[PDB]
Short mmCIF file of C-alpha atoms in Angstrom, two decimals:
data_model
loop_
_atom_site.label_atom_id
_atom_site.label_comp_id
_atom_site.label_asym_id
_atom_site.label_seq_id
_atom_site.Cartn_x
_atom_site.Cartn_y
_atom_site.Cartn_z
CA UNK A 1 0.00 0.00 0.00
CA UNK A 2 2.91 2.03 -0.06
CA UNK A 3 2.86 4.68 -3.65
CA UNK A 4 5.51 4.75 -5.89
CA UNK A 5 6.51 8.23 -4.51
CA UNK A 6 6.17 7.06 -0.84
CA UNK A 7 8.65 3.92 -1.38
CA UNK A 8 10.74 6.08 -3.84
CA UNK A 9 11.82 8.30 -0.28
CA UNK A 10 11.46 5.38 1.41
CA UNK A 11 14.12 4.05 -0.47
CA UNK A 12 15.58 7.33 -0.47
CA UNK A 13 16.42 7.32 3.24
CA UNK A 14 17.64 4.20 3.78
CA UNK A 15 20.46 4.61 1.13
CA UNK A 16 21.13 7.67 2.88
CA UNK A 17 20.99 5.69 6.46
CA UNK A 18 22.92 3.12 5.13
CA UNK A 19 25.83 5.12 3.35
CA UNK A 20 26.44 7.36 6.50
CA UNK A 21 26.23 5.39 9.51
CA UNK A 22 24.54 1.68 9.14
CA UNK A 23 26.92 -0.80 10.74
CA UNK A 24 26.15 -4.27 10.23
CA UNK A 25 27.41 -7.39 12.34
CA UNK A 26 27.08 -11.08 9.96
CA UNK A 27 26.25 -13.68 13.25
CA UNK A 28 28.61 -15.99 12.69
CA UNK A 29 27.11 -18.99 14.89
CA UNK A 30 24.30 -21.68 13.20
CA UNK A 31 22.32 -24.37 13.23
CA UNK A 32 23.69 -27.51 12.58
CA UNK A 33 23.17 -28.76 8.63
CA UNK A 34 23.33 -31.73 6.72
CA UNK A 35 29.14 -29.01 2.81
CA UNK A 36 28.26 -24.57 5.78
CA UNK A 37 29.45 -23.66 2.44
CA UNK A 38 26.69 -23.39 0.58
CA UNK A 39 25.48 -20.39 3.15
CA UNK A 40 28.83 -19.17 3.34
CA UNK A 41 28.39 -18.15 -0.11
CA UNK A 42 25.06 -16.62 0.43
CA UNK A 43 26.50 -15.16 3.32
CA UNK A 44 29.80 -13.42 1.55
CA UNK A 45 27.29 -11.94 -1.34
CA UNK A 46 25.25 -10.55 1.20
CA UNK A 47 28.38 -8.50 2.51
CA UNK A 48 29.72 -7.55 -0.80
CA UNK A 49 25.45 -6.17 -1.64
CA UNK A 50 25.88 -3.85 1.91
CA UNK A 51 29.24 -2.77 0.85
CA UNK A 52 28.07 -1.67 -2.42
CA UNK A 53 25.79 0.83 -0.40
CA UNK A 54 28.75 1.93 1.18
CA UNK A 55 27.48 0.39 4.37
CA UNK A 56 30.42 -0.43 7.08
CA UNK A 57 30.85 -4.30 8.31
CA UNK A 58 31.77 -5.51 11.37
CA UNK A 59 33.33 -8.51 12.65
CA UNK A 60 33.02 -8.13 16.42
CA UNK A 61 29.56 -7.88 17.69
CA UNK A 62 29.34 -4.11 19.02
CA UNK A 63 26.35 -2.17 20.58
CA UNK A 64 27.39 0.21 17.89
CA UNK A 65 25.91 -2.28 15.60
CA UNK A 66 22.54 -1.40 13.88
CA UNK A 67 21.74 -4.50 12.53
CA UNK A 68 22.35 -8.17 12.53
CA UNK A 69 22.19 -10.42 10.01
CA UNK A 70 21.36 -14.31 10.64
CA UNK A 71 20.78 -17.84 9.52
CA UNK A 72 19.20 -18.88 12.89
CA UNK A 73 15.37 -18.80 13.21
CA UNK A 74 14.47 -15.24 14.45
CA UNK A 75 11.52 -16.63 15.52
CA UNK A 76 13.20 -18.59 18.60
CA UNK A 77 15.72 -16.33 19.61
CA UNK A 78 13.48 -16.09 23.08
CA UNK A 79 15.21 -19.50 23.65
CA UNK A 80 18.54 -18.87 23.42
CA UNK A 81 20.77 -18.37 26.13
CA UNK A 82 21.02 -14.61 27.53
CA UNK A 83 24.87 -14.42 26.63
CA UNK A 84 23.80 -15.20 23.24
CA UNK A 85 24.16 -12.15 20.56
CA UNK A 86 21.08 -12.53 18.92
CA UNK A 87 19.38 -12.38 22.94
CA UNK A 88 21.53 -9.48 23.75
CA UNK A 89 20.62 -7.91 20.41
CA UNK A 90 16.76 -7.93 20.29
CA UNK A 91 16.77 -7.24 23.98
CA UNK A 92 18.30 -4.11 23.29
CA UNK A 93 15.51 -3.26 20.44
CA UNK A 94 18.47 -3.89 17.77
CA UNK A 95 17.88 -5.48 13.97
CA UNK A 96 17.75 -8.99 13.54
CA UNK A 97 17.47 -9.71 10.04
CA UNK A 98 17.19 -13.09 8.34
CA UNK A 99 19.37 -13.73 5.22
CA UNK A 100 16.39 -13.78 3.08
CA UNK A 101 15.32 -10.30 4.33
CA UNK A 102 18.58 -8.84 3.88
CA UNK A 103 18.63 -10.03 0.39
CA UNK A 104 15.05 -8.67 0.37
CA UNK A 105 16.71 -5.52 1.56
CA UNK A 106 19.21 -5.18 -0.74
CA UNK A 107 16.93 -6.08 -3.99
CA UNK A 108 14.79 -2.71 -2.68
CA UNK A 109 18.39 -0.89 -3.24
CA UNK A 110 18.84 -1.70 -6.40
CA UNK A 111 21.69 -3.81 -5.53
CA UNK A 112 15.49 -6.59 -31.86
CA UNK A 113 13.33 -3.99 -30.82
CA UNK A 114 10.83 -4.20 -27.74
CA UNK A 115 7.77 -4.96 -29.14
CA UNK A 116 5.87 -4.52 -25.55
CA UNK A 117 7.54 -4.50 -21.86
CA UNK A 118 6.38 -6.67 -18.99
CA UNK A 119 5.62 -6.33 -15.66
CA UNK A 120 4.75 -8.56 -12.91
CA UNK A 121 3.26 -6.82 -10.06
CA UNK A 122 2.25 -9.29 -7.74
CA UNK A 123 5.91 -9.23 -7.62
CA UNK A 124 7.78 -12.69 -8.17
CA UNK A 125 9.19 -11.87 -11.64
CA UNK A 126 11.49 -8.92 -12.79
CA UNK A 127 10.91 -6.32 -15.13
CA UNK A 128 11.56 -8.49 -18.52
CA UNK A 129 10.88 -7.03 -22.41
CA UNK A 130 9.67 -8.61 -25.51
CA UNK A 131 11.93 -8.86 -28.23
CA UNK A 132 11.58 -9.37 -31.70
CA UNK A 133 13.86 -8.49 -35.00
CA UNK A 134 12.10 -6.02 -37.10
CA UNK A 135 13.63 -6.77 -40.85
CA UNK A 136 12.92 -9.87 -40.03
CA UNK A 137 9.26 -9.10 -38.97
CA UNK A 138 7.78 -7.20 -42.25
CA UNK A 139 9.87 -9.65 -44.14
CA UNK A 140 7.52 -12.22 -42.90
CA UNK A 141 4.49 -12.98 -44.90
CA UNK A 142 2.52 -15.47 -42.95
CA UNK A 143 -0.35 -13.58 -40.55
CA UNK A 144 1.10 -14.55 -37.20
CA UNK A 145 4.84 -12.86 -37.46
CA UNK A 146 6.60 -13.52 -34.21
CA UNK A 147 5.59 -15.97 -31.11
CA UNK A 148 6.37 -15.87 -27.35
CA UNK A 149 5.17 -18.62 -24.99
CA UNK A 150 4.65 -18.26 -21.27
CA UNK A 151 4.47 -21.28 -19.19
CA UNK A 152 5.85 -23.34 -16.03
CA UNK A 153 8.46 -24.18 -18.34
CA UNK A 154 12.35 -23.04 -18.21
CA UNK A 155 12.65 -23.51 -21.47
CA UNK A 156 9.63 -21.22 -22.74
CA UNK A 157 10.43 -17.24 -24.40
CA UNK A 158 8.70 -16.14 -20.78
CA UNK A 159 9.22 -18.28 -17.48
CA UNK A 160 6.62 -17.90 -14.91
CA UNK A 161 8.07 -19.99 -12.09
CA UNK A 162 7.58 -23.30 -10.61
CA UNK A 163 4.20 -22.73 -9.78
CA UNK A 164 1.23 -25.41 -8.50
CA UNK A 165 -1.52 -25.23 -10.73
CA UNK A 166 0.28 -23.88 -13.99
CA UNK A 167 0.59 -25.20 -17.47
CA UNK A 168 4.66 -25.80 -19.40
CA UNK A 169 3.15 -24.09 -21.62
CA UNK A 170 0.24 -21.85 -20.39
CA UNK A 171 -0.46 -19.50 -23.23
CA UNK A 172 1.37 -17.48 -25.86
CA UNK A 173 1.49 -13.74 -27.00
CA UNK A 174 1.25 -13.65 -30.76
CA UNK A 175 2.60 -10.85 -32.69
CA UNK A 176 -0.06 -10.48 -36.21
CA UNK A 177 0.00 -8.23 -38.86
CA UNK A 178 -0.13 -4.31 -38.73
CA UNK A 179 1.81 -4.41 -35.25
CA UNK A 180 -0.82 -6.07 -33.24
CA UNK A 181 -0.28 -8.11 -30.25
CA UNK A 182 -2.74 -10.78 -28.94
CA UNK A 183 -3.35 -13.17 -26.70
CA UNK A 184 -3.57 -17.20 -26.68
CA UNK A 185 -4.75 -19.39 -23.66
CA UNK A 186 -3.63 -22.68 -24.46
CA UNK A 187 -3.63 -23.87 -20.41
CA UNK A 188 -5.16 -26.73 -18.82
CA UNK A 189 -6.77 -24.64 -15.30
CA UNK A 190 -7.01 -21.04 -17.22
CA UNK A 191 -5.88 -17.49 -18.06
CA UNK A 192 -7.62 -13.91 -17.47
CA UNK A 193 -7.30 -10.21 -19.21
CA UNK A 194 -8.80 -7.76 -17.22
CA UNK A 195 -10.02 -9.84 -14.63
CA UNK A 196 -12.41 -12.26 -17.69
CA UNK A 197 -11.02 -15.49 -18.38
CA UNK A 198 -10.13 -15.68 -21.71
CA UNK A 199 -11.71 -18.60 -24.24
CA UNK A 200 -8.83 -21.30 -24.81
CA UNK A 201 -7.21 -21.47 -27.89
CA UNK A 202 -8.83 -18.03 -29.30
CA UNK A 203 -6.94 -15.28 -30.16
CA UNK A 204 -7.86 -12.16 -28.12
CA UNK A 205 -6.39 -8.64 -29.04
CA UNK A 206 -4.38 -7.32 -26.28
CA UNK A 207 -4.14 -3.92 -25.48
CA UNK A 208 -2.37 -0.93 -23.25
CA UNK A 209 -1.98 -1.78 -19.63
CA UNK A 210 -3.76 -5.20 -20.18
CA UNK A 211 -3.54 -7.42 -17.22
CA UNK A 212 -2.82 -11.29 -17.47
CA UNK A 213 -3.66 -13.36 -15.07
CA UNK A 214 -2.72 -16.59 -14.36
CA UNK A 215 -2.79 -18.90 -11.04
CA UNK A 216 -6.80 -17.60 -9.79
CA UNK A 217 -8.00 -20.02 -7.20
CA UNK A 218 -5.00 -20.06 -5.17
CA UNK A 219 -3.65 -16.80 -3.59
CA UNK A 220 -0.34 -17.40 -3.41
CA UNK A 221 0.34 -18.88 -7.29
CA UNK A 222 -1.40 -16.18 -8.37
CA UNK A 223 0.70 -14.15 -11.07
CA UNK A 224 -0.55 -10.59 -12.99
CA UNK A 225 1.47 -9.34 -16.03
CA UNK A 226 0.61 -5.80 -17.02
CA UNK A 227 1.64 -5.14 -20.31
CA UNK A 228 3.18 -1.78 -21.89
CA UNK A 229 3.21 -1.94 -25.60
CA UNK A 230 5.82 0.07 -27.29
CA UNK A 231 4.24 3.28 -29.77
CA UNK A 232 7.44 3.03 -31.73
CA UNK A 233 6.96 -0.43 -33.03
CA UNK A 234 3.71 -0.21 -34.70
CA UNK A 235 4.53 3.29 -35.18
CA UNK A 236 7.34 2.31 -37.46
CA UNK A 237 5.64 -1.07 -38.58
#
């Protein structure tokens, strides 16, 4: 519920926080796992995100320490023992961050022609653009000149994760004559446009700030492409 201007200075601020006087303390103790290595990876490419902001790290745990960065369950930290750091830290009201919100953190930090550009915001995929060689295009003769598919599928032109009720191939955006884009539900549980579920295998026109949605019934697989078609394209088409 925060506006783009509202997380634009919230963003703002903590670069500002985080350049001048953020000191951050990587808790080097863990749980025992079933090779260590694996999160001491994660671990050094969290430190090398925070020094990019120009952030300062520790390696002695300080009360000059603003935040704390762990791979121990937050959650329990009430049962550790009181000499522990991450006791000694919340008790005295100082940041306990998991990896995954640090990297969370950091992501909020910033840390062919485009035929139309694509944006997830429900949230799980990154800004990504459609691509498609122009020559190429009006030298094309057949009615449908250029086709993306979208699906559970690594290997499709658009991956939409490894989601529950999703298709390897869920539906396709087909670029037609006369720089037109449209849509194609080939899915076995459904797609939507502007909230209507879309007839399978029919070829709907798409247009500006069109919303896809794919994943209803479930609140969490849920997924909602907005998409920004480019004026130039059909403009020079």
């Amino acid at each position: 519920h925060m506006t783009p201007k509202e997380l634009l200075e919230w963003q703002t601020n903590w670069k500002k926080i985080m350049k001048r006087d953020s000191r951050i303390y990587f808790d080097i103790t863990d749980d025992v796992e079933m090779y260590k290595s694996k999160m001491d990876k994660r671990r050094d490419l969290l430190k090398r995100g925070f020094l990019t902001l120009g952030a300062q790290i520790t390696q002695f745990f300080d009360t000059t320490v603003t935040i704390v960065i762990t791979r121990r369950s937050v959650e329990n930290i009430y049962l550790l023992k009181d000499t522990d750091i991450l006791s000694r830290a919340k008790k005295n009201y100082m940041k306990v961050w998991s990896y995954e919100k640090a990297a969370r953190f950091l992501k909020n930090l910033d840390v062919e022609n485009i035929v139309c550009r694509v944006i997830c915001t429900t949230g799980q995929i990154p800004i990504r653009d459609l691509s498609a060689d122009i020559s190429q295009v009006l030298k094309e003769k057949r009615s449908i000149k250029k086709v993306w598919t979208f699906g559970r599928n690594p290997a499709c032109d658009y991956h939409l994760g490894n989601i529950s009720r999703l298709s390897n191939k869920h539906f396709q955006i087909l670029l037609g004559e006369d720089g037109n884009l449209l849509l194609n539900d080939i899915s076995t549980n459904g797609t939507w446009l502007n909230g209507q579920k879309v007839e399978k295998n029919s070829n709907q026109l798409l247009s500006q700030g069109d919303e896809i949605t794919v994943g209803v019934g479930v609140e969490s697989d849920i997924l909602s492409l907005v998409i920004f078609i480019n004026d130039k394209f059909k403009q020079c088409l």
